[PDB]
Design an enzyme around this catalytic site. Structure first.
Site, mmCIF file in Angstrom:
data_model
loop_
_atom_site.group_PDB
_atom_site.id
_atom_site.type_symbol
_atom_site.label_atom_id
_atom_site.label_comp_id
_atom_site.label_asym_id
_atom_site.label_seq_id
_atom_site.Cartn_x
_atom_site.Cartn_y
_atom_site.Cartn_z
ATOM 1 N N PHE A 70 61.158 17.369 65.566
ATOM 2 C CA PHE A 70 59.966 17.738 65.478
ATOM 3 C C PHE A 70 58.784 16.706 65.420
ATOM 4 O O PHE A 70 59.123 15.505 64.524
ATOM 5 C CB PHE A 70 59.581 18.748 64.276
ATOM 6 C CG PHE A 70 60.181 19.926 64.593
ATOM 7 C CD1 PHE A 70 61.444 20.026 64.667
ATOM 8 C CD2 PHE A 70 59.564 21.344 64.910
ATOM 9 C CE1 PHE A 70 62.191 21.263 64.707
ATOM 10 C CE2 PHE A 70 59.994 22.559 64.781
ATOM 11 C CZ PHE A 70 61.445 22.790 64.884
ATOM 12 N N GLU B 212 64.715 20.200 51.661
ATOM 13 C CA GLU B 212 65.563 19.358 51.057
ATOM 14 C C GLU B 212 66.106 20.148 49.808
ATOM 15 O O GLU B 212 67.329 20.035 49.706
ATOM 16 C CB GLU B 212 65.111 17.938 50.653
ATOM 17 C CG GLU B 212 66.392 17.311 50.261
ATOM 18 C CD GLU B 212 65.975 15.633 50.554
ATOM 19 O OE1 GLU B 212 65.583 15.098 49.649
ATOM 20 O OE2 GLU B 212 66.352 15.175 51.459
#
EC number: 2.4.1.87
Length: 277
Positions: free
Chosen positions: A53, A236
């Protein structure tokens, strides 16, 4: 067939944990045999996809290097499809691709932050996996634009569910891992438990796996939202809790995503891909 024994031989790398408590391998330079693997996978018409992206300025100064490097080092000699989710399109660089490479682009809605740029990313990837990716590729890789392929990042990386070792926290141990400790968050990991601290810049596996990965990270990020809590390291952290509760079948080493800002310890012999500056 193909047994771990056929391409991976730990005794080749300077005692740097090549196996895990769940008998999974940790690919280090010098422990894999590309030669064999290439043949094995070619004979199977295996094709690998890569989602990346790029919103706003990122596209302007990262995408091109990413794509140019990837086209030169990623799964060379094998059918690769690059899935480019961008916010603009009229700006993205059409770089020339080589043999066994092709791509398709997708206009994605920007939002600026993380609870968006990073939250939707998970939703978007799954939406695409179910929509077409599962039907087009055997193994999928999701990565961040701000990276740069440096050398062969080949098929020794494939697996049902692949995880990256954060370059910084790999020497460290579970209690120094920046997991999310606020038990109010979905990405919450206690202080006793913890296998490794995985990087969110690279993770893959089979379409089906990646789907469950993204899906769980999304439903969790979404949950923390309706809870006025934002896990530090956003995606994350959720990922790190997923991989703790769903051990990866394969962990790559910091060599596959190295931060040159750390220099270059003898532990890192060949840098497959580094962080972009």
């Amino acid at each position: 067939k193909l047994k771990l024994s056929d391409w991976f031989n730990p005794f080749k790398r300077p005692e740097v944990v090549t196996m895990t408590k769940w008998k999974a391998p940790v690919v280090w330079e010098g422990t894999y045999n590309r030669a064999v693997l290439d043949n094995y996978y070619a004979k199977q018409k295996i094709t690998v996809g890569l989602t990346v992206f790029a919103v706003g300025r990122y596209i302007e100064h990262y995408l091109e290097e990413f794509l140019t490097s990837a086209n030169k080092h990623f799964m060379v000699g094998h059918p690769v499809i690059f899935y480019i989710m961008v916010d603009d399109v009229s700006r993205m660089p059409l770089i020339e691709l080589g043999p066994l490479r092709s791509f398709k682009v997708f206009k994605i809605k920007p939002e600026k932050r993380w609870q968006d740029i990073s939250m939707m990313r998970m939703k978007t990837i799954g939406e695409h996996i179910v929509a077409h990716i599962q039907h087009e590729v055997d193994f999928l890789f999701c990565m961040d634009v701000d990276q740069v392929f440096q050398d062969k990042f080949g098929v020794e990386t494939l697996g049902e569910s692949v995880a990256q070792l954060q370059a910084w926290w790999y020497k460290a141990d579970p209690n120094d891992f920046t997991y999310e400790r606020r038990k109010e968050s979905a990405a919450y990991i206690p202080f006793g438990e913890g296998d490794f601290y995985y990087h969110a810049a690279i993770f893959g596996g089979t379409p089906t796996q990646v789907l469950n990965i993204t899906q769980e990270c999304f439903k969790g990020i979404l949950k923390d939202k309706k809870n006025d809590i934002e896990a530090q390291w956003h995606d994350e952290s959720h990922l790190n809790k997923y991989f703790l509760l769903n051990k990866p079948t394969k962990i790559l080493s910091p060599e596959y995503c190295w931060d040159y800002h750390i220099g270059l310890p003898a532990d890192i012999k060949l840098v497959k891909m580094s962080w972009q500056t």
